[model samples]
Target chain A: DHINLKVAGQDGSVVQFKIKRHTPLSKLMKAYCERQGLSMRQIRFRFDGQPINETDTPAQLEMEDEDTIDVFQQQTGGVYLEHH
Target chain B: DLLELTEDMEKEISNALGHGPQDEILSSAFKLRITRGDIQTLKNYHWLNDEVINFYMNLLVERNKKQGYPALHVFSTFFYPKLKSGGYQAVKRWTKGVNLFEQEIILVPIHRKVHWSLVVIDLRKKCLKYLDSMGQKGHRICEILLQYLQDESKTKRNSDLNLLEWTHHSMKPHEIPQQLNGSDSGMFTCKYADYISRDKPITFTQHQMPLFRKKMVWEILHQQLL
Candidate 1:
């Protein structure tokens, strides 16, 4: 069985990717990033708005047929200097 | 007679309102009189006014002396005039003819570059209300105030202040973790929990910082007015 999943970035950018039913989440991160042309640092994964760390086990965690994954980018150093 | 009137007013008002304590009422009246330039007016109420005003004046004078400034100097210059004008304006708008025996006033000395904003608290009810009904806008006002103060103090003294400048702001979207049963999954959950916990206190600091930031925001908000 294959799981169809949606990946989204913090800025609301979204991309869809398919993974084998038992693929580990860690591997899915690399696969998804490659498919979306995103770097490891450019995205964070979330399951139903809950963040998933870089080392999570995706294979053991069963995904629903249409599970939504959210990507969040770290916000650092930008908002502060723009006003100054 | 004015002293008698004040005492009578205090007693009657205290009885009617049943709010702030007697000492508070007397202290507030003394402040009102001094600020109103009604020191002589106290004499009209006879010994009662005389005694109260004299006591208050002595206390004020002593306080100023301890602070290394003459009481008469401040009264004649800063305190009396500013209070007479500004205090009266506030009273006129809010309380009307009703003489409130207990007035809670805060003296916040903000730097010159910041803006002065107002927050009114009803000590009786313990509720804080913003001046001019600005609500959250008051918070932004505070931010500007602090920023301006930071800039002004830096320029006036020619000293470099360590100010944090924020840069490179971006938000990342959510993604589902590929692994459903890994330690990293738990770590991600912890991070989100931490983010939610810290949000409120951060907003509170932002809300309350206006008075401290007054100098800077005032400069930016009203460069023309200055």
Candidate 2:
């Protein structure tokens, strides 16, 4: 009922956390953001290339021991205007 | 399986489409944020933007994670254009910690400015299949992706992808569903990936577009397929 998950960033940094499988990932997410001095709005968390929700638990996502959740810069869609 | 929407899901989707903060992040997953404007594109007769399509593609990859599905990899909506404009060097880091060769299939979402299509690299079948909802040809697009595989193989593995072992195809109009209007092509693109990711036949038709749009709103909100 417990799992160890790694949160890896695009810059090659990895942080490992151990938690109960049924516990919400929001706990891990909050800890990661706080440790990095980042905001939830500034980054996103993904597991196996799938977007992960704060409400989703490790067991719910079928996560296994040592499965890594990737961290990437937040992206927005639609067109952006560039100044000349 | 055709997904049926419950009243609660419909109600949640209704609130999603209803007013709140347009730019605030309503849902964040797969590195993409779905804002009120992002889900708003799913409204009837509206063109889907990148966030919606990319999020849906991530869901497809996520679904395949279940025990019985194929091993899949999906490139985001930004992948193709970046590869095209800047070539392999630009996107090599896109696969930093992952290996494409380990995946049974690779899905590329091709966004042609105002239109959309899909390219499937079926490693199990050993071929690339292109699906355009408007019944258009994409042989060149398939070629570009094949070249990508070759370069990716070299960059990541220091080995060449056996070009002869791979082939490319563009599904003809009669072979796949055809969109009747411009707005639905993006939805069609998403559904095409959805079916192909599961090794299922492209059985859905243009008629189901409306329901799919509503269903997608819930899927995005819930971060899971129904």
Candidate 3:
């Protein structure tokens, strides 16, 4: 069965996608990041206000037709040391 | 103070509340979500806090240090915070009294946003590894730490350091098996450090990590590495 899921980005952008049944949530996470030009370190996915593991499938999480997943930027680690 | 905590009290609190340890309840004060009838439990994700990681890492490091390996060190979970916020000078001061060259390994567990990962420096092996259970390469972290080391070498060692001999390996999802569960990255990093210190590469399977969660807790409580 094809399902539609809402993805909300950390930047306040929301998008929707159609995915197949039993599709791993990782697939959707990758798709969402690709669409936004984000790398693995740049984005994280969450559902129902809890972080979503890449191994989880929608079927496993019991997601619904319009279940929303939040895509957040990983903002903590920096690329270079700040010079004092 | 630990002796004051009875097993019966802990069991009673866990039984009554479902998960939050009485110790957690006593120190922390957070609201619990509840329906009309189900008002006695925590509903949100219980991310392993820094306190737990620090307690667990210290146990592993100290126990092994007792075994005559004084070269092992465990940095706080906020190791990156100081570098990013203050500068390399902050980090130098952070490990002010310690000698990095004399150490065989130093583990720096870090949090980026909500996810967890760490940097492991094997000074003896001349290798730096970034480990993430989620298989993040930690590209950003690697760059910062290399610079931190170079800065340390120039300021403290009284000479310029050449990093050409160092092996910088940041694990990626494509290379290593990633964690299936969210919020377990910190545990993975700790276990990775624990195992690598023993000269054993991390052989933990993805699923075994969550089980390690339960195991590590009990091990910590008993003051033993199981």
Candidate 4:
């Protein structure tokens, strides 16, 4: 029940991570960041290329077999500068 | 509803162009050219005598005349190597003038405060500038716009911060503005005058908007809308 995930950046750099069966997405992301040397705030999560909220309720989400979770760095600058 | 309409229109056009329902050649080669300003090359496309080409051009011109600005989308199929080897030629063959497929989407802003933007999806792996005849110029414009989206110093410091943020963060679903439809989409804004330049002055006027809209709708209904 483990899922193989891939996280890529604009520069084409990629990292692979695994999620245990029934693991909440929130916890999975934390573990992912720790393993990749990325701070929690530095990464953004996408399920099959669509961005998902970090605070989304775990019960509402479940990873399927072989589902890909692409974690990209939050693009900074431009208009997001003020918000950051 | 729009996507459904687009799909149906695509199907009809595919059949009209002498291709089957499942033919990838017709679908991949055809495209919709949407513009908010005048393009000189459209005149050349209008002169092509093919039923399908004339159908598309008449619709585009009519739409532009009714709408202050027209967005012309045309569908064309590329002949596969097998077909070419078998003696099939590309439909709507006109050699004197550049094909509509070779044009660039130029945004000329009329008002300084009002900005223009667009999102292009390239179905083919070739460069987007492949269609542009003015090679380096088109390349520079596209590159600058992309860079502006990523450059905090230029866009973030400007008063037009909303447009800047919309260009970048809007790539994510939650951050998109109401006007935008979906993710993987990019937004851009520029004054109308800034879009047009000293070389390309605006010739089309506001009175044209409705005609263009009517024509566009008609083309859509006939499956001739690109």
Candidate 5:
């Protein structure tokens, strides 16, 4: 009952997630992509204009209260493997 | 049974399943969720919630674009309820941006008192066919939708659009399947749309629910036909 999460998707859509306190933020990101029928590698997560790592937690991030997390899809981007 | 699923796939299902025991065959993989309430559990027959229905219907509109077939649109499940209760002006106001009459097909998923039924408006035929899982008929909903159309035409087009040539039916035809129990109405409604959308001879029965559910999950993940 610890998770009261709000996520704003990149596609101009928003969703609320119900999860546990100890669950990693990655789980929430995965769920959001699965709903949109997109994959994790094709997705990105952000909050407060900063990137949120998979290992980050709302609990550890001191974001336990009800809030909205900003996000956008990774569908359209150029991937460079051998870049500087 | 999970032969199609890999290690990462299994872990993804577990994450979506949360605390409940997942069926692990289909569903919980590419669940169609825009907001809260995404749960699918197997109890004799697979049970589906609104998110899946909404997602599936929208996907139809998206996929139908490239085809040469007629244009299709799906009204949200709550469409009928709001139309019936709020009247034409209310509906017209709510549906301010979209015109319902231009499309050839309109899929309406209606459920009330915790029972789900489907209403397909074939504009070419000018018919509003309601497909119910049980051998039941939705004459009332059919009439209401017809009336809504008439009123909508009057308000939107400012013309008296009489639904005189329209046809409506509800009995499960010789070809369509039936749900043995009441729990599968939603799933049955889904397959109803499937056959009608493809114009294929409808077939299948209660025993196929498991397979059908799996097929849905399959189509959802693959976003293609079986």
Candidate 6:
């Protein structure tokens, strides 16, 4: 079985792709980033309000057709010293 | 028994530490992945990475599924910086199915590149709490969260969160358990959430860390708290 998934970027861009049930979303992620001229490391994807793993399949996530995957920038931790 | 790992848990931990594909996904749920490499960071003295911190935070949310416990919503480690740098518009959609007003506790794990801390929104108590194992104060963080709360309410609920009576607190060093070394901040952050989520007192100390690390490995592997 296959389903159409929408990737909603933080910048207000929306892209859709059709993917299989068991195929890893890694392919979809890589292709999405490639087409957008972005690095996979520079962004994170969330489905059902949780961060989606690249290895996860739509079936694994229990996602259905027309489901939207939200995308956000890769936020890293920092060491900031406290003053006062 | 909390400090002591069961025999089966020990065996699982041993298996976890054994040779395997480091990048291979060992656990996947809540749309998050826990790889062998991520679990390796939970091992002693290695600072917990984003994956581990995020995974464990989700586990806490999982534990809240039982009846009679307070409802919780946990933000990713990425949330704070996004909200801070980009303001409310950046993270407005992060809460899709979640209604913050419906949750009793909202946990936001703060990751300072090399350190870990937590910001807790206790709706029932009507206050915001910050827990940093290093005893660092986060008054500014609380202010940002307060603003986020107001914006979230106005945007989502079409109303404003009452802030005149809402208070914010940063845990004092003498009040909360303090980390003795650099590496345990992440563990401390996780434990703070674990205890606070239960409305339990923060009584664990640095001496209990080694046990907590192994125990956390078990919890993450089993996806349940001991």
Best by DockQ: 6
Task: State the lDDT of candidate 1 residue by residue for B149-210, as single tens digits.
Answer: 34433544445434343111112222223322221211222122122222211111222222
Model 3 agreement with the true structure over A1-84: per-residue lDDT tens digits? 888899866455789988776887778888877787877644456564344666677878777787777655433322222258
lDDT of each: 0.32, 0.80, 0.61, 0.32, 0.62, 0.80
The order by descending DockQ is: 6, 2, 5, 3, 4, 1
Candidate 1 regions with alpha-carbon error over 4 angstroms:
A10-13, A79-84, B1-226
Predicted candidate 5 versus true structure: per-residue lDDT over B1-226, tens digit per residue: 1135456654554444445433333332222332212334322243555556655766666666655556877765546664666456534553555787788888888774545678988887887778777656788888988888888788888997767788787654753454345467777777777666656546667677765665555455445544
**What is candidate 6's lDDT per residue for B93-119, written digit by digit as tens?**
789668889989999998765678899
* DockQ, structure candidate 2: 0.08
Q: How close to the true structure is residue B10 of candidate 6, measured as C-alpha lDDT? A: 89
Q: What is the TM-score of each candidate against the true structure?
A: 0.27, 0.72, 0.58, 0.28, 0.61, 0.80
Steric collisions counted per model? 55, 2, 0, 30, 0, 4
lDDT of 5: 0.62
- Model 1 docking tier (incorrect/acceptable/medium/high): incorrect
User: Where does model 4 exceed 4 Å of error?
Assistant: A9-14, A55-63, A78-84, B1-117, B120-226
Across all candidates, what is each one's fraction of true contacts kept? 0.00, 0.07, 0.02, 0.00, 0.00, 0.27
For residues A1-84, write the lDDT of model 6, one tens digit per residue.
989999978777899999898989989988888999896545778774567776888898888999888777644333334359
Sum up the clashes in candidate 3: 0
| TM-score of candidate 5 versus the correct structure, residues matched by position | 0.61
Give the lowest summed-lDDT range of ten residues in model 6 chain A: A74-83
Q: Give the TM-score of candidate 6.
A: 0.80
